[PDB]
Amino acid sequence: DAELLVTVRGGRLRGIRLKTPGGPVSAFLGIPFAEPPMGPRRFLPPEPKQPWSGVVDATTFQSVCYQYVDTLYPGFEGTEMWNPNRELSEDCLYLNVWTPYPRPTSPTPVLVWIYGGGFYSGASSLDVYDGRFLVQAERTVLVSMNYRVGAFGFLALPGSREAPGNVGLLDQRLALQWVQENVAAFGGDPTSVTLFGESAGAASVGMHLLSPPSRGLFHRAVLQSGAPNGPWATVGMGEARRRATQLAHLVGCPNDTELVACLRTRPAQVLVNHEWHVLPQESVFRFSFVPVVDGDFLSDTPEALINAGDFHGLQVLVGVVKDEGSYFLVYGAPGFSKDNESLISRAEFLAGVRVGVPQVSDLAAEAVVLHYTDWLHPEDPARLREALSDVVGDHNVVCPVAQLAGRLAAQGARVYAYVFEHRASTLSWPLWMGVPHGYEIEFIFGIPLDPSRNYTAEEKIFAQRLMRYWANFARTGDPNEPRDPKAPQWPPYTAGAQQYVSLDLRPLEVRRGLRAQACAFWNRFLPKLLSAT
Amino acid sequence: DAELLVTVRGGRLRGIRLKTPGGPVSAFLGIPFAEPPMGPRRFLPPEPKQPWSGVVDATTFQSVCYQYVDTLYPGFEGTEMWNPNRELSEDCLYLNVWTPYPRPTSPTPVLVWIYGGGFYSGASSLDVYDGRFLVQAERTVLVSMNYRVGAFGFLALPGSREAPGNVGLLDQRLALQWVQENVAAFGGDPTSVTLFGESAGAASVGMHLLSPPSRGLFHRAVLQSGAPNGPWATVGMGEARRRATQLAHLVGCPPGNDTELVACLRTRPAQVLVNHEWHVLPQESVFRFSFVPVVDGDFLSDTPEALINAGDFHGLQVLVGVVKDEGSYFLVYGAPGFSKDNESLISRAEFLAGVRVGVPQVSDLAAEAVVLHYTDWLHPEDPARLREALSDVVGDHNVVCPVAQLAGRLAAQGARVYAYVFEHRASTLSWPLWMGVPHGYEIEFIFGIPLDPSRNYTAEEKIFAQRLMRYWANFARTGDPNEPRDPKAPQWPPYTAGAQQYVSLDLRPLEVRRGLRAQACAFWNRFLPKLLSAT
Ligand SMILES: CC(=O)N[C@@H]1[C@@H](O)[C@H](O[C@@H]2O[C@H](CO)[C@H](O)[C@H](O[C@]3(C(=O)O)C[C@H](O)[C@@H](NC(C)=O)[C@H]([C@H](O)[C@H](O)CO)O3)[C@H]2O)[C@@H](CO)O[C@H]1O
Ligand SMILES: *[C@@H]1O[C@H](CO[C@@H]2O[C@@H](C)[C@@H](O)[C@@H](O)[C@@H]2O)[C@@H](O[C@@H]2O[C@H](CO)[C@@H](O)[C@H](O)[C@H]2NC(C)=O)[C@H](O)[C@H]1NC(C)=O
Ligand SMILES: *[C@@H]1O[C@H](CO[C@@H]2O[C@@H](C)[C@@H](O)[C@@H](O)[C@@H]2O)[C@@H](O[C@@H]2O[C@H](CO)[C@@H](O)[C@H](O)[C@H]2NC(C)=O)[C@H](O)[C@H]1NC(C)=O
Ligand SMILES: *[C@@H]1O[C@H](CO)[C@@H](O[C@@H]2O[C@H](CO)[C@@H](O)[C@H](O)[C@H]2NC(C)=O)[C@H](O)[C@H]1NC(C)=O
Ligand SMILES: C[N+](C)(C)CC(=O)N/N=C/c1ccccn1
Ligand SMILES: C[N+](C)(C)CC(=O)N/N=C/c1ccccn1
Ligand SMILES: [Cl-]
Ligand SMILES: [Cl-]
Ligand SMILES: [Cl-]
Ligand SMILES: [Cl-]
Ligand SMILES: [Cl-]
Ligand SMILES: [Cl-]
Ligand SMILES: [Cl-]
Numbered sequence A: 001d002a003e004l005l006v007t008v009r010g011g012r013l014r015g016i017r018l019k020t021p022g023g024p025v026s027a028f029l030g031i032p033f034a035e036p037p038m039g040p041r042r043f044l045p046p047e048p049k050q051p052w053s054g055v056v057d058a059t060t061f062q063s064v065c066y067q068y069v070d071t072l073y074p075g076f077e078g079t080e081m082w083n084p085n086r087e088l089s090e091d092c093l094y095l096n097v098w099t100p101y102p103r104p105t106s107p108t109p110v111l112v113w114i115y116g117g118g119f120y121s122g123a124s125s126l127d128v129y130d131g132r133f134l135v136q137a138e139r140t141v142l143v144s145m146n147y148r149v150g151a152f153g154f155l156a157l158p159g160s161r162e163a164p165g166n167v168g169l170l171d172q173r174l175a176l177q178w179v180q181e182n183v184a185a186f187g188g189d190p191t192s193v194t195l196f197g198e199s200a201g202a203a204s205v206g207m208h209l210l211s212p213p214s215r216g217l218f219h220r221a222v223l224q225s226g227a228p229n230g231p232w233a234t235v236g237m238g239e240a241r242r243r244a245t246q247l248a249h250l251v252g253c254p255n256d257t258e259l260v261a262c263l264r265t266r267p268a269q270v271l272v273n274h275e276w277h278v279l280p281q282e283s284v285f286r287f288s289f290v291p292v293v294d295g296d297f298l299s300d301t302p303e304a305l306i307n308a309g310d311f312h313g314l315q316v317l318v319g320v321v322k323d324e325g326s327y328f329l330v331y332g333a334p335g336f337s338k339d340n341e342s343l344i345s346r347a348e349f350l351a352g353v354r355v356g357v358p359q360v361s362d363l364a365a366e367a368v369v370l371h372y373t374d375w376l377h378p379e380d381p382a383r384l385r386e387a388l389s390d391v392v393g394d395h396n397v398v399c400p401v402a403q404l405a406g407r408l409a410a411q412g413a414r415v416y417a418y419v420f421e422h423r424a425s426t427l428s429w430p431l432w433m434g435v436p437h438g439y440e441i442e443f444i445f446g447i448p449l450d451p452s453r454n455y456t457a458e459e460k461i462f463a464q465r466l467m468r469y470w471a472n473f474a475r476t477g478d479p480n481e482p483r484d485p486k487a488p489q490w491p492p493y494t495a496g497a498q499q500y501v502s503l504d505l506r507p508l509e510v511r512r513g514l515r516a517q518a519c520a521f522w523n524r525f526l527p528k529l530l531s532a533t
Numbered sequence B: 001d002a003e004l005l006v007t008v009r010g011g012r013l014r015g016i017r018l019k020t021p022g023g024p025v026s027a028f029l030g031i032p033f034a035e036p037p038m039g040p041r042r043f044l045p046p047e048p049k050q051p052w053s054g055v056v057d058a059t060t061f062q063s064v065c066y067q068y069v070d071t072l073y074p075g076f077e078g079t080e081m082w083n084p085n086r087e088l089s090e091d092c093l094y095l096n097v098w099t100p101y102p103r104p105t106s107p108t109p110v111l112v113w114i115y116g117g118g119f120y121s122g123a124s125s126l127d128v129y130d131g132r133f134l135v136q137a138e139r140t141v142l143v144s145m146n147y148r149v150g151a152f153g154f155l156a157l158p159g160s161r162e163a164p165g166n167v168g169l170l171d172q173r174l175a176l177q178w179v180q181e182n183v184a185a186f187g188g189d190p191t192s193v194t195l196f197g198e199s200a201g202a203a204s205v206g207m208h209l210l211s212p213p214s215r216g217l218f219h220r221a222v223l224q225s226g227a228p229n230g231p232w233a234t235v236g237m238g239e240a241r242r243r244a245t246q247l248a249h250l251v252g253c254p255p256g257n258d259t260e261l262v263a264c265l266r267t268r269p270a271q272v273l274v275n276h277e278w279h280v281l282p283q284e285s286v287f288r289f290s291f292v293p294v295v296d297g298d299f300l301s302d303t304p305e306a307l308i309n310a311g312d313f314h315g316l317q318v319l320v321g322v323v324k325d326e327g328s329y330f331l332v333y334g335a336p337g338f339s340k341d342n343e344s345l346i347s348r349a350e351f352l353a354g355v356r357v358g359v360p361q362v363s364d365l366a367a368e369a370v371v372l373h374y375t376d377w378l379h380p381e382d383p384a385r386l387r388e389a390l391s392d393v394v395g396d397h398n399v400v401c402p403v404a405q406l407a408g409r410l411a412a413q414g415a416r417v418y419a420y421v422f423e424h425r426a427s428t429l430s431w432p433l434w435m436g437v438p439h440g441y442e443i444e445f446i447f448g449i450p451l452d453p454s455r456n457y458t459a460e461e462k463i464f465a466q467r468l469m470r471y472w473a474n475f476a477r478t479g480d481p482n483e484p485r486d487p488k489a490p491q492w493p494p495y496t497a498g499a500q501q502y503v504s505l506d507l508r509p510l511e512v513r514r515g516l517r518a519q520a521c522a523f524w525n526r527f528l529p530k531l532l533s534a535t
């Protein structure tokens, strides 16, 4: 019917009606937003999609951008839920729109979701990103886009116009430009556009906040388990060159314009098969192709722009999960497995510190180890495992997020912080991993409401609470209800009081400090030490 | 009384009967154990006392070695109890013996006490060091001696033969030699001598373990709130020369150069040297007094930390401990914003400054490590927290962690080690409540001072003091502070490098706990060295 037929600036779309226990939602899946970045357009900033004849079929998710498909635990849902669920294609720059079925006659606010995956993986078609429940429950419009990952999104020869860098970020910015122009055709309000994302998606949200050409395309920002100032999310120019020139040597590619032309002649699968082999430490925490500090998108290091920005007028929702680090340990760290209790040894632990804190001196590593050993039980394997889980989690997610949250708060922003502390009753990982990196998203998106998944009565209620908080924030920059007794339940995060809430089944609880003591080491002392040595 | 006339290798002594509530003790006070270190003998090692004719009057304490007198809180009980209580004289090398009234029939173990005072102060004649109550209640023999402090005991021009250094420690060794030769006259057993000391006396006891010629003179060791590997307890030969010649400059002594310089210092009156001792290294408090034991390669063949890691320690029984609030007393002596008369609610600015006072001579980066370690990053402005924090910084750095280091290294090489944390604040205690259990305030209880009728301690406190006297007396008799065949009480398990068990001493029964600030002392004993040498 005419509810599923929409015309945007480029032409006609035909969407699909999706069902929700609450009721139906109108969905437009796989709307092209850039000309396919293929052949000579590989590694280049995206070009806007030109108008098309006829009716585009937006009834299903388009393709996934090329990436390594994880095969650590084959057939295991804990890993499979995150793997690509469409064909891989360099023809992948498509976005998706969910909107209420009585299409809003008034302009409703817009959530835009940027998926994470450490800049080396990810897809908007993953099942845990289904916008239908968030839309049907809170009557906002939800948009999500694909953006190039891996070398396709982030190979850079700083200097050249052929491989400029950060084109995966520009993919996102283009889709936000698209939202500006077309969201109103679906009921959306271009003037209330809230960015949210997790992991590299959250780091992405962070860079749009620091990149002036993007700061005009959205108004509020949610960062979940990621920060642009994290040790894994940017790379220098001179290093970006070495990594590009190395991938080229690996793929058999004999100046800069000549380098890119050879890479462009290689099947996309050949680049994916070598991009992990670029760095000797084949680590998840220093993946080869991430955003570059070139002076373009980022006029300075993310740290530099944070410490110097006026963030008056910005509201920000920010948080981590309880155990950020445990998911990364099974992907590398020596002694670990989803299939036993991963009872690490001291030397396995000393070794793991180097894998999760890569590229720090020897003195810095000893500092980490002395800082995180329990000197009354120096060789307890369980305690050691938890310690290492904290070392990588604190260093890569928590202390970066914290450092950003306080700086934003201190320099004019209005911040609300959380820690996600619910372990799903469906969670297929082992119990020692706890609440792992990535496992709040199911709840933000209202997945427990899907009748076919097997979540708890109490868990559906929790997901609705969370959706309420997020939509509240989208609407007003304030997750609290505009009208309620005992009204300031969720207080703002400030550099002093450092209040956050804990999100779980029990009613909101305020706590002080996001690993305040731990993050003093990472944000304040460790740099001084890397310096004077 | 036949018990008060006693004869010693040097000659005859007349002693005095002292009263305890529980009964008499006979005491010999101010026995000359060395020829007086005067004029030409100033700064030299001690010569043994030439023997005398007649009866030495050993019925009253002799003089106190020259030293700074504390003018900080005039009249105040808390400071005055430590101040010299006899005339200051360079003629001060005498020792004291308390022995049970009916002199013991069989050879009883001997406790030798070495007083503290950070090597710039102290005297065996102070009231809290009265042996009578311990000797009456446990029937051991007790000895204490005076040793030279300040520049008179520790000024060194390494290589001089004029000022060889460590003569204050030689003073103590001379008295231990005297005990070996003479305590038999008082019913004491020279084959069962236990040293015990506090503060710089505990550091002294430690250096005696590390100096072979002293190991023949005792068999067990108790170290209370002090250790020879503390940052304040020793000095290099090169630093020792700077400080010696800087003092010579402050007194007007043109600097053979070593022999002129010392002969000049000898002419200056003793009080003039005391006056400038602290101005050799001006500082705000009490850490790093400038005339301490020197690592000369004679008395201390190597640094204490070297001597500890490879030493002859198997079979040694050691008793070792700290007070609950080791830091707070030092802060009162010059940490910015500290007095005994207000709550010492310091600002962050004074906290940062106080870190450099209590942890002197460390790099700017090292000091930042300290701050970032002891700050409470949830309440970094809270003045009360900052106050306790800085107390722990200086308490950990100067006392607790050096003692924890010594304990585990002894235990590792096969010493039998027993560790305590004294955590009872005397109901009499005159210092303010926020200093808690300050440095030096277990001594009163070890010595049974609560038994003294004039001082009104509690009954709970008297039975406690008797409990402590028994622990220490048990230890002196048998190298084990536990009630021999009595496991009706909780056992005091020995300290090992793995489990790290110690007992809390207070008015409640023995409580066994693990780890002497294990987390804190990793920083001080392991990381901070690496940091300081790698940068
Ligand atoms: C008691 C008795 O029967 N005879 C003693 C006699 O043994 C003693 O001589 C001293 O014995 C001690 C034993 O512990 C040392 O071995 C002395 O050698 C040293 C020392 O190591 O202490 C050598 C040291 O280099 C000297 N230091 C200097 C010169 O700076 C000291 C110094 O003489 C001190 O006076 C000792 O405390 O001695 C050994 O000489 C003598 C006193 O020395 O007394 C007898 O009665
Ligand atoms: C716990 O498991 C890890 C991972 O090994 C996997 O899971 C086990 C249950 C077992 O079935 C293995 O075959 C699996 O591959 C163990 O770490 C591995 O140990 C082997 C020893 O032969 C070694 O070759 C591997 O490299 C190790 N893997 C890593 C990542 O280091 C570990 O030994 C198991 N046991 C304990 C006590 O942790
Ligand atoms: C708590 O007391 C200290 C003690 O210092 C003072 O000592 C005397 C010289 C006299 O000024 C008394 O009133 C005090 O007891 C205070 O620290 C001093 O503060 C004054 C000025 O306020 C300053 O001139 C001194 O240098 C300070 N001493 C230092 C830095 O060591 C402290 O301010 C008191 N706190 C209060 C009153 O809240
Ligand atoms: C790298 O070398 C290539 C050669 O493959 C250079 O390409 C030139 O491009 C211009 C375009 O106007 C041609 O007219 C030339 O004939 C090409 N070949 C040359 C100059 O040898 C390219 O300019 C070089 N890249 C640089 C200098 O950045
Ligand atoms: C967890 N999820 C399955 C949603 C994908 C993801 O987030 N993978 N994480 C990569 C990474 C690596 C280093 C630092 C941060 N993120
Ligand atoms: C008088 N009292 C019992 C407190 C003796 C004492 O302990 N005086 N202080 C010594 C000191 C100084 C610096 C470092 C270590 N100890
Ligand atoms: Cl368009
Ligand atoms: Cl469906
Ligand atoms: Cl048409
Ligand atoms: Cl606007
Ligand atoms: Cl642009
Ligand atoms: Cl950065
Ligand atoms: Cl870099």
Ligand SMILES: [Cl-]
Binding pocket: A236, A237, A238, A239
């Ligand atoms: Cl570089």
Ligand SMILES: [Cl-]
Binding pocket: A269, A270, A273
């Ligand atoms: Cl290949």
Ligand SMILES: [Cl-]
Binding pocket: A273, A274
């Ligand atoms: Cl491969």
Ligand SMILES: [Cl-]
Binding pocket: A068, A276, A282
């Ligand atoms: Cl791989």
Ligand SMILES: [Cl-]
Binding pocket: A322
């Ligand atoms: Cl937690």
Ligand SMILES: [Cl-]
Binding pocket: A361, A362, A363
């Ligand atoms: Cl290095």
Ligand SMILES: [Cl-]
Binding pocket: none
């Ligand atoms: Cl345990």
Ligand SMILES: [Cl-]
Binding pocket: A413, A414
């Ligand atoms: Cl505001």
Ligand SMILES: [Cl-]
Binding pocket: A455, A456, A457, A458
């Ligand atoms: Cl149910």
Ligand SMILES: [Cl-]
Binding pocket: A513, A514, A515, A516, A517, A518, B378
């Ligand atoms: Cl904290």
Ligand SMILES: [Cl-]
Binding pocket: B032, B056
């Ligand atoms: Cl005499």
Ligand SMILES: [Cl-]
Binding pocket: B039, B040, B266
């Ligand atoms: Cl002379």
Ligand SMILES: [Cl-]
Binding pocket: none
């Ligand atoms: Cl006389």
Ligand SMILES: [Cl-]
Binding pocket: B088, B089, B090, B091, B270
């Ligand atoms: Cl005199």
Ligand SMILES: [Cl-]
Binding pocket: B215, B218, B219, B316
């Ligand atoms: Cl021995």
Ligand SMILES: [Cl-]
Binding pocket: B236, B237, B238, B239
């Ligand atoms: Cl030297």
